[PDB]
Design an enzyme around this catalytic site. Structure first.
Site, PDB file in Angstrom:
ATOM      1  N   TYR A  88      -7.308   4.964  18.109  1.00 21.08           N
ATOM      2  CA  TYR A  88      -6.663   5.289  16.838  1.00 21.08           C
ATOM      3  C   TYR A  88      -6.495   6.823  16.733  1.00 21.08           C
ATOM      4  O   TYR A  88      -5.383   7.341  16.479  1.00 21.08           O
ATOM      5  CB  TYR A  88      -7.457   4.715  15.628  1.00 21.08           C
ATOM      6  CG  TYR A  88      -6.982   5.349  14.351  1.00 21.08           C
ATOM      7  CD1 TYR A  88      -5.817   4.912  13.737  1.00 21.08           C
ATOM      8  CD2 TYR A  88      -7.650   6.447  13.802  1.00 21.08           C
ATOM      9  CE1 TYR A  88      -5.335   5.546  12.575  1.00 21.08           C
ATOM     10  CE2 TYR A  88      -7.187   7.075  12.642  1.00 21.08           C
ATOM     11  CZ  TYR A  88      -6.040   6.622  12.042  1.00 21.08           C
ATOM     12  OH  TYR A  88      -5.590   7.245  10.908  1.00 21.08           O
ATOM     13  N   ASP A 100      -3.213  12.090   9.547  1.00 19.59           N
ATOM     14  CA  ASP A 100      -4.584  11.780   9.135  1.00 19.59           C
ATOM     15  C   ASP A 100      -5.363  13.086   8.979  1.00 19.59           C
ATOM     16  O   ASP A 100      -5.506  13.857   9.947  1.00 19.59           O
ATOM     17  CB  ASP A 100      -5.245  10.871  10.175  1.00 19.59           C
ATOM     18  CG  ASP A 100      -6.611  10.390   9.752  1.00 19.59           C
ATOM     19  OD1 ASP A 100      -7.249  11.046   8.901  1.00 19.59           O
ATOM     20  OD2 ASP A 100      -7.053   9.341  10.259  1.00 19.59           O
ATOM     21  N   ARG A 104       0.807  -1.226   0.000  1.00 14.35           N
ATOM     22  CA  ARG A 104       0.000   0.000   0.000  1.00 14.35           C
ATOM     23  C   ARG A 104       0.841   1.278   0.000  1.00 14.35           C
ATOM     24  O   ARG A 104       1.783   1.396  -0.803  1.00 14.35           O
ATOM     25  CB  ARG A 104      -1.024  -0.038   1.143  1.00 14.35           C
ATOM     26  CG  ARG A 104      -1.953  -1.275   1.075  1.00 14.35           C
ATOM     27  CD  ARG A 104      -2.828  -1.468   2.327  1.00 14.35           C
ATOM     28  NE  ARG A 104      -3.562  -0.250   2.688  1.00 14.35           N
ATOM     29  CZ  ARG A 104      -4.660   0.199   2.077  1.00 14.35           C
ATOM     30  NH1 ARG A 104      -5.201  -0.468   1.055  1.00 14.35           N
ATOM     31  NH2 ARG A 104      -5.227   1.328   2.492  1.00 14.35           N
ATOM     32  N   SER A 153      15.735  14.423   7.382  1.00  9.02           N
ATOM     33  CA  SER A 153      14.375  14.733   7.791  1.00  9.02           C
ATOM     34  C   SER A 153      13.560  13.495   8.095  1.00  9.02           C
ATOM     35  O   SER A 153      13.941  12.366   7.757  1.00  9.02           O
ATOM     36  CB  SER A 153      13.666  15.645   6.770  1.00  9.02           C
ATOM     37  OG  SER A 153      13.232  14.924   5.634  1.00  9.02           O
ATOM     38  N   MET A 194      -6.638   9.109  19.066  1.00  9.49           N
ATOM     39  CA  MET A 194      -5.672   9.541  20.073  1.00  9.49           C
ATOM     40  C   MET A 194      -4.232   9.338  19.603  1.00  9.49           C
ATOM     41  O   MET A 194      -3.411  10.214  19.795  1.00  9.49           O
ATOM     42  CB  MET A 194      -5.910   8.773  21.369  1.00  9.49           C
ATOM     43  CG  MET A 194      -7.190   9.207  22.102  1.00  9.49           C
ATOM     44  SD  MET A 194      -7.511   8.057  23.435  1.00  9.49           S
ATOM     45  CE  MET A 194      -6.167   8.387  24.555  1.00  9.49           C
TER      46      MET A 194
HETATM   47  N1  LIG Z   1      -5.466   4.542   3.771  1.00 13.18           N
HETATM   48  C1  LIG Z   1      -6.067   5.677   4.165  1.00 13.18           C
HETATM   49  O1  LIG Z   1      -7.251   6.115   3.594  1.00 13.18           O
HETATM   50  C2  LIG Z   1      -5.497   6.555   5.231  1.00 13.18           C
HETATM   51  C3  LIG Z   1      -6.247   7.627   5.748  1.00 13.18           C
HETATM   52  C4  LIG Z   1      -5.686   8.435   6.733  1.00 13.18           C
HETATM   53  C5  LIG Z   1      -4.399   8.165   7.175  1.00 13.18           C
HETATM   54  N2  LIG Z   1      -3.675   7.127   6.646  1.00 13.18           N
HETATM   55  C6  LIG Z   1      -2.326   6.859   7.157  1.00 13.18           C
HETATM   56  O2  LIG Z   1      -1.378   6.650   6.128  1.00 13.18           O
HETATM   57  C7  LIG Z   1      -0.498   5.596   6.483  1.00 13.18           C
HETATM   58  C8  LIG Z   1      -0.590   4.502   5.411  1.00 13.18           C
HETATM   59  O3  LIG Z   1      -1.918   4.016   5.308  1.00 13.18           O
HETATM   60  P1  LIG Z   1      -2.239   2.515   4.796  1.00 13.18           P
HETATM   61  O4  LIG Z   1      -3.699   2.409   4.570  1.00 13.18           O
HETATM   62  O5  LIG Z   1      -1.266   2.129   3.751  1.00 13.18           O
HETATM   63  O6  LIG Z   1      -1.848   1.705   6.125  1.00 13.18           O
HETATM   64  P2  LIG Z   1      -2.139   0.205   6.583  1.00 13.18           P
HETATM   65  O7  LIG Z   1      -2.151  -0.668   5.390  1.00 13.18           O
HETATM   66  O8  LIG Z   1      -3.403   0.126   7.366  1.00 13.18           O
HETATM   67  O9  LIG Z   1      -0.914  -0.159   7.549  1.00 13.18           O
HETATM   68  C9  LIG Z   1       0.403  -0.009   7.051  1.00 13.18           C
HETATM   69  C10 LIG Z   1       1.305  -1.066   7.651  1.00 13.18           C
HETATM   70  O10 LIG Z   1       1.393  -0.855   9.046  1.00 13.18           O
HETATM   71  C11 LIG Z   1       1.950  -2.008   9.553  1.00 13.18           C
HETATM   72  N3  LIG Z   1       1.502  -2.361  10.898  1.00 13.18           N
HETATM   73  C12 LIG Z   1       0.218  -2.524  11.353  1.00 13.18           C
HETATM   74  N4  LIG Z   1       0.290  -2.928  12.633  1.00 13.18           N
HETATM   75  C13 LIG Z   1       1.600  -3.040  12.991  1.00 13.18           C
HETATM   76  C14 LIG Z   1       2.265  -3.417  14.157  1.00 13.18           C
HETATM   77  N5  LIG Z   1       1.625  -3.789  15.274  1.00 13.18           N
HETATM   78  N6  LIG Z   1       3.642  -3.403  14.155  1.00 13.18           N
HETATM   79  C15 LIG Z   1       4.380  -3.036  13.046  1.00 13.18           C
HETATM   80  N7  LIG Z   1       3.729  -2.670  11.892  1.00 13.18           N
HETATM   81  C16 LIG Z   1       2.369  -2.678  11.886  1.00 13.18           C
HETATM   82  C17 LIG Z   1       1.438  -3.165   8.666  1.00 13.18           C
HETATM   83  O11 LIG Z   1       2.535  -3.963   8.285  1.00 13.18           O
HETATM   84  P3  LIG Z   1       2.412  -5.514   7.831  1.00 13.18           P
HETATM   85  O12 LIG Z   1       1.480  -5.597   6.666  1.00 13.18           O
HETATM   86  O13 LIG Z   1       3.795  -5.922   7.414  1.00 13.18           O
HETATM   87  O14 LIG Z   1       1.927  -6.363   8.975  1.00 13.18           O
HETATM   88  C18 LIG Z   1       0.771  -2.477   7.486  1.00 13.18           C
HETATM   89  O15 LIG Z   1       1.147  -2.997   6.227  1.00 13.18           O
HETATM   90  C19 LIG Z   1      -0.922   5.074   7.845  1.00 13.18           C
HETATM   91  O16 LIG Z   1      -0.173   5.725   8.859  1.00 13.18           O
HETATM   92  C20 LIG Z   1      -2.350   5.538   7.927  1.00 13.18           C
HETATM   93  O17 LIG Z   1      -2.841   5.707   9.244  1.00 13.18           O
HETATM   94  C21 LIG Z   1      -4.205   6.314   5.688  1.00 13.18           C
HETATM   95  C1  LIG Z   2      -8.674   2.084   3.431  1.00 17.76           C
HETATM   96  C2  LIG Z   2      -9.477   2.209   4.722  1.00 17.76           C
HETATM   97  C3  LIG Z   2      -9.871   0.840   5.284  1.00 17.76           C
HETATM   98  C4  LIG Z   2      -8.669   2.969   5.723  1.00 17.76           C
HETATM   99  N1  LIG Z   2      -7.543   2.382   6.230  1.00 17.76           N
HETATM  100  C5  LIG Z   2      -6.759   3.020   7.142  1.00 17.76           C
HETATM  101  N2  LIG Z   2      -5.638   2.446   7.668  1.00 17.76           N
HETATM  102  C6  LIG Z   2      -4.874   3.112   8.587  1.00 17.76           C
HETATM  103  N3  LIG Z   2      -3.755   2.544   9.109  1.00 17.76           N
HETATM  104  N4  LIG Z   2      -5.225   4.363   8.988  1.00 17.76           N
HETATM  105  C7  LIG Z   2      -6.328   4.954   8.476  1.00 17.76           C
HETATM  106  N5  LIG Z   2      -6.698   6.181   8.877  1.00 17.76           N
HETATM  107  C8  LIG Z   2      -7.131   4.294   7.552  1.00 17.76           C
HETATM  108  N6  LIG Z   2      -8.249   4.896   7.052  1.00 17.76           N
HETATM  109  C9  LIG Z   2      -9.044   4.260   6.135  1.00 17.76           C
HETATM  110  C10 LIG Z   2     -10.267   4.941   5.580  1.00 17.76           C
HETATM  111  C11 LIG Z   2     -11.482   4.841   6.497  1.00 17.76           C
HETATM  112  C12 LIG Z   2     -10.015   6.414   5.269  1.00 17.76           C
END
Ligand SMILES: NC(=O)c1ccc[n+]([C@@H]2O[C@H](COP(=O)([O-])OP(=O)(O)OC[C@H]3O[C@@H](n4cnc5c(N)ncnc54)[C@H](OP(=O)(O)O)[C@@H]3O)[C@@H](O)[C@H]2O)c1
Ligand SMILES: CC(C)c1nc2nc(N)nc(N)c2nc1C(C)C
Ligand SMILES: NC(=O)c1ccc[n+]([C@@H]2O[C@H](COP(=O)([O-])OP(=O)(O)OC[C@H]3O[C@@H](n4cnc5c(N)ncnc54)[C@H](OP(=O)(O)O)[C@@H]3O)[C@@H](O)[C@H]2O)c1
Ligand SMILES: NC(=O)c1ccc[n+]([C@@H]2O[C@H](COP(=O)([O-])OP(=O)(O)OC[C@H]3O[C@@H](n4cnc5c(N)ncnc54)[C@H](OP(=O)(O)O)[C@@H]3O)[C@@H](O)[C@H]2O)c1
Ligand SMILES: NC(=O)c1ccc[n+]([C@@H]2O[C@H](COP(=O)([O-])OP(=O)(O)OC[C@H]3O[C@@H](n4cnc5c(N)ncnc54)[C@H](OP(=O)(O)O)[C@@H]3O)[C@@H](O)[C@H]2O)c1
Ligand SMILES: CC(C)c1nc2nc(N)nc(N)c2nc1C(C)C
Ligand SMILES: CC(C)c1nc2nc(N)nc(N)c2nc1C(C)C
Ligand SMILES: CC(C)c1nc2nc(N)nc(N)c2nc1C(C)C
Lengths: 248, 249, 249, 247
Positions: free
Chosen positions: B155, B142, B13, B136, B157
């Site tokens: 989350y 988020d 991702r 950096s 928090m």
């Molecule tokens: N996707 C969104 O719409 C969204 C929205 C707002 C903010 N964000 C932020 O952007 C960043 C990337 O998002 P994403 O959706 O790509 O994230 P994600 O797939 O939910 O998580 C990214 C990686 O975090 C690792 N992870 C989860 N739990 C862990 C643990 N206990 N110890 C070590 N690693 C752990 C996992 O690694 P493994 O797969 O190797 O286990 C996972 O592949 C995140 O910080 C997320 O909060 C995303």
């Molecule tokens: C793709 C979906 C399931 C999703 N995944 C997320 N994963 C992490 N780690 N953090 C988020 N804020 C996060 N947020 C969303 C959406 C609700 C925006």
């Protein structure tokens, strides 16, 4: 009967002032404390002298650990055991000390600063909701966006507490529980603090060039738990004499 | 000689897109992962095929615990072992799931959500700064922190704490020439397993184009922040959300 | 001597509730109005029946123009001429209507929306301060300023400028013992006129009770801010929105 | 065809740096100015020497008045007249001076400070949209929440500009027009001399130095670029950590 409130870290200083002002408003109070046993007992005696059977103490360490949820559940339980109800929770207890990025271990620093400032408020909020004019007031910090140098863990905790205030306001609203914050600037400088350092802080405050009294902070808590705040949830009131508005 | 970067949660991702773009810009990369071992090893293989020994993998659970400080130190150590330097840290790994106020125990949920989103970033920042040009750190924040998902208090928090760290660390590490910034996605890369009808529900909310961000679009903001074009930028959090956070209920 | 307050746009709705509640607290009041002459006079009559010589009216258009500084001076002057003092200023009056980017000319829309919401508050603040216990100003802000109504750019700009004024005036007037704060309503007192679908739509969005605020609940926050219980509070904006601003799209 | 950009207050300093940077990235530019005629013409000349017929000047007072909408419409019109298109609008021009609450009249101060910092950007945004990788970048201020003492009108203007950035991002999204901000801290110290300059420099965590005009323009260039295609309603602080420092 009279409503009941839990105030954490209520033995001394701002927590004490908040407990006193709640008690004067007609609340029964649980004075939570960690180390200040003598001050807590003395405060309870005094409130009970004023109105019989209206204050109890409750000791608990609010450092993060695997037993913290049970310790927080027990605090809420102690209010119900004493008074048969719990209407108000005030998350006031807080560890505050520098943790430079570049002696307590770091794991202990994490547990104390994050536990007291954020995780315990969360668990206490959980236990409070589960047991149920209900409201929670979190003691925040007006300087969260211009933090003390080298206070990263403390600052992370207080930021987390803002997040909790908003999330809990949103989630608990359907249950009629309001969740708000009071954000002090510099308040009640320790008599023991160096006079030069006291003056340095006081000189910074636009409104009166003095720190808040503990009673001024308490006043804002009182407003938020009152009938005059019935539509207010998710709000954080700065009580800082304009300190946050001053540029470097 | 080439700079080096650590990206946490870089197997899949957004973390993957970030690692790939950094590598494409000329960085050598540490691909941190937790459970996604095949994805991580495969990614390192792909990148090493492109340029010899410019990628290594490092596994670690970032849950809060007594061993978390040593784990974070070892992640930074792995960058130095492989590449002799560590110029960039990207705190991307994140647990995300609901924790209602009303089979994991709550202490475990606290440990995972606060650990991954806040404490590990802190400890990684400490190790990064202590182990030390254009240095950096970029924290994945988020865009919706002030309008959070219902029942996601822990989350939310954790992500608020991360905004606090970004600011505190920007302030404290500036004298050391280390900039600290954030990228705040709105909705990005909806899980392929999510029904298209629900993917469209979040999509419909986004003002700019009625679609979620690609991981590459998120990576683009990271690339900017680590670049020489951002040399005076520190303590800044860039929303990459297509206007999502501006939309009222 | 009883203290005196000026309330702008005080003939009806929220401004009226503020005037009534200030009067009930012991204030003498200047009821400013623009077009609502009959309601303004009626309110003055009612308050004067309660305590003789405690309410007066003052008519003024608060649209921006070359004459606005004199109009705002005269509003403050009306309080001194009637009551011999002016302790509190409440900036409540507000124009609110859409100004899409793609009969009123645009320059008129600018004058009305920026005048009422921002420039008049500034000039009234100027006049109040220069004419000078427990002195304070309360500005009626908007809890949805960061998630604005679609096509309300000028309205939103005015309310954002009002936040700037609240902060700038708090800083500058702190030495003179004048506090400056804001109250930010979410949805409040929906008009009967509004559609039954539209009103329901807004109500069902409010987490706390699925209903709009009453004018009195908005007034309660104003009363707190002017009171001795807020003596250390300056530059603060209190949301009174039932959690509306926390709700994502 | 090369894309075209309007930059307000572009004769000198940060506006010029932005104009120069856009031109280097391949844009044709309208150099708007108010009083700095010589500097504006001079820049247009240097840019046209680099690439023929790629720059024009355009004079306009951006003080609020009843003719301001016409003036802003004419600025956008001038881009279409010269280049046949208008892809980017940068709201850079700004009046900045104290207006204490306790020889310019207050009505002039209101007109200049609110006009240049907020109303002109709004009117230009309207005209930009109506006339249609399209985007607008607003020059904001990293210190909006810790304002200069006695600068209320200036501060109100920059607050209104944040509101515009947000409102226009929301509304112009369906039209494919992104709206973002760059918020400088202290940049390019002049009027002012040392040591007052060095008092400001000592405040900045990151290098104890003000931002170069080039550093501000770098952030503008990013927001207009394809690397920011999903970014709208975002304000990027370029302040070297200044806004993080407590009193
Ligand atoms: N996707 C969104 O719409 C969204 C929205 C707002 C903010 N964000 C932020 O952007 C960043 C990337 O998002 P994403 O959706 O790509 O994230 P994600 O797939 O939910 O998580 C990214 C990686 O975090 C690792 N992870 C989860 N739990 C862990 C643990 N206990 N110890 C070590 N690693 C752990 C996992 O690694 P493994 O797969 O190797 O286990 C996972 O592949 C995140 O910080 C997320 O909060 C995303
Ligand atoms: C793709 C979906 C399931 C999703 N995944 C997320 N994963 C992490 N780690 N953090 C988020 N804020 C996060 N947020 C969303 C959406 C609700 C925006
Ligand atoms: N004072 C200020 O200028 C200021 C500024 C900004 C924010 N605030 C916030 O306002 C609130 C009150 O301020 P304050 O100065 O009165 O606070 P304080 O004296 O620093 O702390 C209050 C109490 O917290 C309790 N505490 C500390 N560690 C604990 C632990 N591990 N477990 C349980 N309790 C623990 C202590 O209880 P025991 O004494 O019983 O051990 C202490 O008396 C705090 O949340 C603070 O962060 C204060
Ligand atoms: N109601 C809400 O849901 C809500 C939400 C967010 C913020 N607010 C804020 O709360 C405050 C009170 O709201 P409200 O709904 O009670 O307000 P409102 O009824 O919309 O307006 C209040 C008064 O403003 C005066 N006014 C309008 N144009 C004027 C002009 N050109 N010159 C002088 N006065 C003028 C009018 O006076 P006349 O009637 O005498 O002509 C009107 O009665 C406002 O500042 C509003 O922006 C309200
Ligand atoms: N420099 C900083 O430390 C700093 C800090 C925070 C924010 N900013 C923001 O960044 C932007 C650029 O800063 P800067 O210092 O380069 O700006 P500046 O030199 O103070 O002003 C830029 C241009 O604005 C134009 N201008 C002033 N009044 C005008 C009017 N009434 N009508 C039309 N144009 C007018 C002037 O054009 P002419 O010369 O042609 O008359 C001037 O060259 C501004 O928006 C500023 O607020 C700068
Ligand atoms: C009165 C002094 C010692 C002080 N004490 C504090 N205690 C806690 N718990 N939290 C603070 N933010 C806090 N802040 C200060 C000031 C430095 C503001
Ligand atoms: C109740 C309706 C008519 C309404 N009226 C308003 N009037 C003013 N002056 N300002 C607002 N923000 C305002 N907002 C609303 C709602 C959209 C909340
Ligand atoms: C370099 C000096 C003279 C300076 N000039 C400015 N010009 C404008 N237009 N806006 C500012 N916020 C602005 N701010 C400063 C500093 C006082 C920060």
């Amino acid at each position: 009967e009279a409503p009941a409130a839990v105030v954490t870290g209520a033995a001394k200083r701002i927590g004490r002032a908040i407990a006193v002002k709640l008690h004067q408003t007609g609340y029964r109070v649980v004075i939570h404390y960690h180390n200040s046993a003598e001050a807590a007992v003395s405060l309870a005696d005094e409130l009970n002298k004023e109105r019989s059977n209206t204050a109890v103490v409750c000791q608990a360490d609010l450092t993060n650990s695997n037993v913290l949820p049970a310790s927080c559940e027990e605090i809420i339980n102690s209010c119900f055991r004493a008074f048969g109800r719990c209407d108000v929770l005030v998350n006031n207890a807080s560890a505050f000390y520098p943790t430079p990025l570049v002696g307590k271990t770091v794991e202990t620093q994490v547990a104390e600063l994050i536990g007291t400032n954020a995780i315990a408020p969360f668990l206490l909020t959980m236990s409070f909701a589960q047991r149920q004019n209900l409201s929670i007031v979190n003691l925040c910090d007006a300087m969260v966006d211009q933090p003390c140098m080298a206070f990263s863990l403390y600052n992370m905790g207080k930021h987390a507490l803002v997040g909790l205030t908003q999330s809990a306001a949103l989630e608990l609203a359907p249950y009629g529980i309001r969740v708000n914050g009071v954000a002090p600037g510099v308040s009640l400088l320790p008599v023991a603090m160096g006079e030069e350092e006291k003056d340095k802080w006081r000189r910074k405050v636009p409104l009166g060039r003095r720190e808040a009294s503990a009673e001024q902070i308490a006043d804002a808590v009182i407003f938020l738990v009152s009938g005059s705040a019935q539509y207010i949830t998710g709000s954080i009131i700065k009580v800082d004499g304009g300190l946050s508005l001053v540029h470097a």
